[PDB]
Amino acid sequence: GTENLYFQSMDELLRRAVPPTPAYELRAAGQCADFVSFYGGLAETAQRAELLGRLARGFGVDHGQVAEQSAGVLHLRQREAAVLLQAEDRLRYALVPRYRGLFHHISKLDGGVRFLVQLRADLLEAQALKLVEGPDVREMNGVLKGMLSEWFSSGFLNLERVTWHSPCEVLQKISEAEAVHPVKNWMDMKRRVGPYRRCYFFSHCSTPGEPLVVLHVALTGDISSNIQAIVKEHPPSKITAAIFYSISLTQQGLQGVELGTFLIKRVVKELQREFPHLGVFSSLSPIPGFTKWLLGLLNNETLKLLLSSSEWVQSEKLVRALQTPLMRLCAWYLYGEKHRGYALNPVANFHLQNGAVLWRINWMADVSLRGITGSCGLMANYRYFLEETGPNSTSYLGSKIIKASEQVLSLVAQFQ
Amino acid sequence: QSMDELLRRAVPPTPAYELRAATPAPAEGQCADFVSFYGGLAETAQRAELLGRLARGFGVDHGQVAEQSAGVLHLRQQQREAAVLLQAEDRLRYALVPRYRGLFHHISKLDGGVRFLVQLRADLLEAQALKLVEGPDVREMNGVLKGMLSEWFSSGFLNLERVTWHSPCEVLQKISEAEAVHPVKNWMDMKRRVGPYRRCYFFSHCSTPGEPLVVLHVALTGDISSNIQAIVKEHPPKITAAIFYSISLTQQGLQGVELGTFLIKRVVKELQREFPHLGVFSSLSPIPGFTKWLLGLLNETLKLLLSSSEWVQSEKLVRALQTPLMRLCAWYLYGEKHRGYALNPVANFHLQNGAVLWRINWMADVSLRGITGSCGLMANYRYFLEETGPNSTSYLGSKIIKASEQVLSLVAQF
Numbered sequence: 001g002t003e004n005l006y007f008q009s010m011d012e013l014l015r016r017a018v019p020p021t022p023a024y025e026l027r028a029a030g031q032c033a034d035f036v037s038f039y040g041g042l043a044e045t046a047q048r049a050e051l052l053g054r055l056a057r058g059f060g061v062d063h064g065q066v067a068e069q070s071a072g073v074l075h076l077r078q079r080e081a082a083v084l085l086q087a088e089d090r091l092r093y094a095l096v097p098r099y100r101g102l103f104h105h106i107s108k109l110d111g112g113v114r115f116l117v118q119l120r121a122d123l124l125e126a127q128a129l130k131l132v133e134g135p136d137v138r139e140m141n142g143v144l145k146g147m148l149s150e151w152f153s154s155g156f157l158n159l160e161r162v163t164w165h166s167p168c169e170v171l172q173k174i175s176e177a178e179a180v181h182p183v184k185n186w187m188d189m190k191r192r193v194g195p196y197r198r199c200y201f202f203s204h205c206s207t208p209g210e211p212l213v214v215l216h217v218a219l220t221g222d223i224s225s226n227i228q229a230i231v232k233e234h235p236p237s238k239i240t241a242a243i244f245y246s247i248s249l250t251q252q253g254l255q256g257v258e259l260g261t262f263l264i265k266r267v268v269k270e271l272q273r274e275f276p277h278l279g280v281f282s283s284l285s286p287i288p289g290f291t292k293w294l295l296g297l298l299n300n301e302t303l304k305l306l307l308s309s310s311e312w313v314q315s316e317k318l319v320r321a322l323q324t325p326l327m328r329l330c331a332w333y334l335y336g337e338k339h340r341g342y343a344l345n346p347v348a349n350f351h352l353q354n355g356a357v358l359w360r361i362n363w364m365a366d367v368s369l370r371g372i373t374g375s376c377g378l379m380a381n382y383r384y385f386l387e388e389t390g391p392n393s394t395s396y397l398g399s400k401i402i403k404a405s406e407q408v409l410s411l412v413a414q415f416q
Numbered sequence: 417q418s419m420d421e422l423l424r425r426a427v428p429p430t431p432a433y434e435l436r437a438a439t440p441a442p443a444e445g446q447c448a449d450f451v452s453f454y455g456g457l458a459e460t461a462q463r464a465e466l467l468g469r470l471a472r473g474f475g476v477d478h479g480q481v482a483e484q485s486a487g488v489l490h491l492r493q494q495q496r497e498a499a500v501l502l503q504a505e506d507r508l509r510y511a512l513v514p515r516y517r518g519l520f521h522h523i524s525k526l527d528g529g530v531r532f533l534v535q536l537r538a539d540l541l542e543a544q545a546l547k548l549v550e551g552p553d554v555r556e557m558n559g560v561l562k563g564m565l566s567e568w569f570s571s572g573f574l575n576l577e578r579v580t581w582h583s584p585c586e587v588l589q590k591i592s593e594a595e596a597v598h599p600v601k602n603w604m605d606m607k608r609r610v611g612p613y614r615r616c617y618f619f620s621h622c623s624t625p626g627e628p629l630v631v632l633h634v635a636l637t638g639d640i641s642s643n644i645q646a647i648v649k650e651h652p653p654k655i656t657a658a659i660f661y662s663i664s665l666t667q668q669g670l671q672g673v674e675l676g677t678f679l680i681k682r683v684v685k686e687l688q689r690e691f692p693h694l695g696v697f698s699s700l701s702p703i704p705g706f707t708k709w710l711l712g713l714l715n716e717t718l719k720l721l722l723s724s725s726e727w728v729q730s731e732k733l734v735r736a737l738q739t740p741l742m743r744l745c746a747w748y749l750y751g752e753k754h755r756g757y758a759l760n761p762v763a764n765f766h767l768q769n770g771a772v773l774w775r776i777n778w779m780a781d782v783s784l785r786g787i788t789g790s791c792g793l794m795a796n797y798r799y800f801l802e803e804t805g806p807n808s809t810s811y812l813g814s815k816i817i818k819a820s821e822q823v824l825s826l827v828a829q830f
Contacts (some may be wrong), residue, residue, distance in 0.1 A: 029812075066505060067492050070485035077482055082552050088481060088512065095509045113572055135499035139506070149437075150567060154525040156623065205622035206573060258439060262525075353438065390441035397438050 010051050013038050018059050019101045024093045032105040036115055048122050049131035056132075056140040059098040069094045100143055113151055113206075120144045121253035145256050152204060152254055154262045157212070159270060162199040164190055173211050173250065174201065180246040180286065181231055181368070188231070192216060196235035198242075200267050201250075202259060213259040215267055216246035219275075223381055224284045225362045227371070241280035242271050247350075261354055268386065281384040282359065285347050286366060287375035290333050293344070294326075294376070313372050322376075323363055324414075330361055330378050331411030334402075341400045351382035352396045355389030358382060358404040361411065418453075419466050420473075426450040427474045428518050433510050439522070447522045451532055463539050464548035471549075471557035474515040484508035517560055530568055530623070534669035537561050541671060562672060568621075569670055571678045575625060576686060579616035581607055587626050590666075591618065594631050597662040597702065598648055598783075605648070609633060613652035617683050619675060630675040632683055633662035640796055641700045642777045644786070657696035658687050663765075677769055684801065697799040698774065701762050702781060703790035706748050709759070710741075710791065725788050734779070737791075739829075742776050745793050746826030749773055756815045766797035767811045770804030773797065773819040776826065 017035040042048045069091035076087050106112045123141055126132040162174060171193070175183045183189050193199045198217035203210050218230045219239040230245050244267075247260050268281060291308060298305040312318055335358060337344035343352055352358070358380065365371070365379030383405075385392075395401040404412075427450070428443040457463045488504050523529045540558055543549040579591055588610070592600045600606050610616050613636045618628035635647045636655040647661050663676050684697060707723060714720040727733055750773060752759035758767055767773070773795065780794030781787070798820075800807075810816040819827075 061505065063501070063505075066508075067489055070488050070508070073485050074482060074489070084478065085552055085556070088476065088478075091481075091485065091508070092512045095505060095512065107572065108570065110572075135502045138499075139502055142506075150521075150564075153521070155527075155529055156568075156573075256437065258437075261439070355441065393441040397435055397440070 006047075007050070009038075010054055014051070014054055014058060017102070018055070018098060019105055021062075021096075021098050021101065024090050027093060032102060032109060035102065036106060036109065036112075039115075039119070045122060045125060045129065046131055049126035049129075052119075052123050052126060052140070053132045053134075053137060055099050055102075056136040057134070059102070060136060060139065061095055061097050065094045066091065097139070097143060099140060100147075103144060103147055107147075107151075116144065117148065117251055117253035119253070120148060120255075121251065124252060124255060148254060149257045152212070152257050152259065154258075154266075156205050157202040157259075157262070158205055158208060159266050160201050160203055160209070160211075162193050162201060164193055166193070167209065170209055170211065174199070174214050177211065177214065177248050177250040178246065180248060181227060181366075182370075191234070192231070194235070195237050196220075196233075196239070198267075198271065200263070200270070202263055202266075211250040212254060213250060213263050214246070214248040215244060215260075215263050217267065217271065218243040218245050223280065223282045223360070223383070225360070225365060225379075225381075227284060227366045227368075227379060230284070239275060239278065241282060242268075242275075242278060244281075244283040244285075247283075260350065264354060264384075268384070279386075281386065283351060283356065283382045283384075284362070284365065285351065285380055285382055286371070287330060287334070287345060287378050287380055288347060289345065290330060290375040290378065291373060293333055293337070294329060308376065310369055310373050313367065313377065319364070326376055326378065327361055327363060328411045328414040330376075330380075331408055332415045334358055334361075334380065335404055335408060335412050336415070338400075342396075343402060348380070348382070352402055353393060354382075354384070355391075355393035355396075356382035356384050357392065358402055358408050360405060360407055419469055422449070422453050423466070423469060423473060426453065426519075427470070427515060428522055430477070430515050430518065433507050436510060439525075443518075443522045444525070447519060447526060450519065451523060451526065451529075454532075454536070460539060460543055460546065461548055464543035464546075467536075467540055467543060467557070468549045468551070468554060470516055470519075471553040472551070474519070475553060475556065476512055476514050480511045481508065484511045514556070514560060516557060517564075520561060520564055524564075524568070530565075530621075533561065534565065534667055536669070537565060537671075538667070538669035541668065565670060566673050569629070569673045569675065571682070573622050574619045574629070574675075574678070575622055576679075576682050577618050577620055577626070577628075579610050579618060581610055583610070584626065587628070590628055591616065591631055594628060594664045594666050595662065596664045598644060598781075599785075608651070609648075611652065613637070613655070615658075615683075615687065617679065617686070619679055628666055629670065630666065630679050631662070631664040632660060632676075632679045634683065634687065635659040635661055635700075640696065640698045640775070640798070642775070642780060642794075642796075644700060644702075644781045644794060645783075647700065655691060655694065657698060658684075658694060660697075660699040660701075676765065680769055680799075684799070695801070697801065699766060699771065699797045699799075700777075700780070701766065701795055701797055702786065703745060703749070703760060703793050703795055704762060705760065706745060706790040706793065707788060709748055709752070710744060723791065725784055728782065728787050728792065738778055741791055741793065742778060743826045743829040745776055745791075745795075746823055747830045749776070749795065750817055750819055750823060750827050751830070753815075757811075758817060763795070763797070767817055768808060769799070770806075770808035770811075771797035771799050772807065773817055773823050775820060775822055 013034065017031050019031050039051065042051065073087045073091055076084050103116060106116060127137065162170065171189055175189050196219045198219065201211040201214045203212060218224065220243055221240045223241050224230055224243045227245060244264065249255060249259065271278060295305055295308060334343065334345055334348050343349040348358065360381040362379045362381065364377040366375065367377055371377055392403050395403065426446050428440065428446050431440065454466065457466065484507050488508055491501050491504055520533060523533060544554065579587065588606055592606050615634035615636065617632050619630045620627050621629060635641065637659055638656045640657050641647055641659045644661060660680065665675060687694060711720060711723055749758065749760055749763050758764040763773065775796040777794045777796065779792040781790065782792055786792055807818050
């Protein structure tokens, strides 16, 4: 009754709120504020999913005009340099979706870019909850990811350090947006910003003291093989290695703007300024989705599927027996298991893109509830050899090659 | 010869459609070589040769565009999948993005990168003005670059800073030096312009605080000012009107990024926050190019010689030239057009912003530049905030100039 009125309103608002595309000939000569107002007044994520789905599908590209312009370019190929360029630009203009003009005019508003980050955070969520589907919403994602990638480029971000002198609103923000290894109490947070620890974040030049992405570094004497050893440690007031034990994205709307890739790049330069005799850099990273992949394969060795759900770690006989098998299955999950030719694991793909080496597989590195249920206690060290991060980054993105240690490659030699 | 080899190894290559999201590792080092070689170019003619080659050589791959255009049309003859078409459309969309855009993008990420690109557009504009570079390829590259600069220097990315005698003297020097309207005489004059009954505001980029891009000088008075010497040469110890007596830009590379339009918008909001009972806003703007236009018409021989500073000395000549020069000024502002819009650049600026050609002031600037520039004449472009929106629309859209009865009477005389 009042539901069919909510649906009717969206279609009217998108018509009168989405700015119109002018003719290519006249492309040189309040609507957006109505959109922001209506979008704000949407309570549930399912409501917002309905509006985003209609915007993507209804206000994209005029597929008809694109074909007319595509043929118009091919008709000239059978005149003049300026004649060709004008027809190319006609097609370039025809390929610009009508919603892009809305996102562009919204940015020009007070707190406009902030709104758009929230709107892509919701769009990515609605896609994850399968509330929105289709290639139209996927295109609208890329258009937004593209615009945001220009506003939040490396050169518009400031590197800020978190100490116990930082505001508690910033420490709360950093504590809350910490899904890797959650913070237990305020005394734990004080330790993670305390001596032998370095906590860094990126803020936009526009919004200082607002974390966009967070990186936790531990100053140690060896490449760490255990997370408990880092998080549950009381260091006093010489360092050989810098271990990245946690990397977190605060704004989910900026998922894919390479914020973490530039964060590590920056922090290393900062740590090299502070310790000019520091040449060991590595991560101690979780292997999320491993247990899920392992249980997904297991579809009597039925005892295995059942047991692999936290409680199995209690038996010393079962853990000891599962060392060599789970480590060779992990080595394959990281090195051999692919997705679109690239590494199946999202964390491994992240570090391999950055030029890291799949250096070590650590048994019972995270004996926490999330550590055992997530990656069966296993963690890995993606080692950063600064002298070769460049070529490794290139070899992975370009030729889809994973550089791995002899330890890791031996475990894959055991498999297959 | 070096330019062709350098550009081939300094302009980052177009990544595969599949890897269009990832920053290549060499792309930083490639763009730093460009900045280094560009810096080492002495004359503008050298820089013009490099920019001309970049535009022409590193634009769009015209061959791949035709392959993608045909590929889309092959998918039209046969009603294919929705996602199949969209991917083919996006490949064509990607094929239409020029290779130099990736250089400008990767240069920005560099330390002092956006600063370099502002200088590079300042040079590109100059080389075009000196006809060192020509063609539609350099025109496209200036649009690509201006487009990027118009996003980085958007109101959201700018800070509104206020200048008081508490500001660093490096900022006051920068602001004194930036004066492109009514030059500052001494440090005591500058102290007055930031002093009581005066508001000085500027825009700095969020990346570079305390570095002015655009400056606006406001005078807090009891009436709409009719004389500039009454403002600049005054020792102040209730305010009715806010008079904008000077607006200055500091970067030629940001020519067309609409900074002055956003400063007036933001300064008014700031003035209203300070003074909620303030409803009178106007400018006291000069009329530059008027004397030049007037002398240009005179080609009646005595006035062509006399109109060059010294004529103001005779009280009989000034008194006689009061009613004629004001009616010729009224026409120069209201009737004289350029591409249908106001001939005067200052008048076009304020009318775009939604101002009204409110008053023509006789002997408002009796300075050497004031008499030689606009024959002592100045004008008040009044901002009626309740109607700035429709006035802005009427001027840009229908090319209509809203004027006062005083101004329209002088055009009725003409």
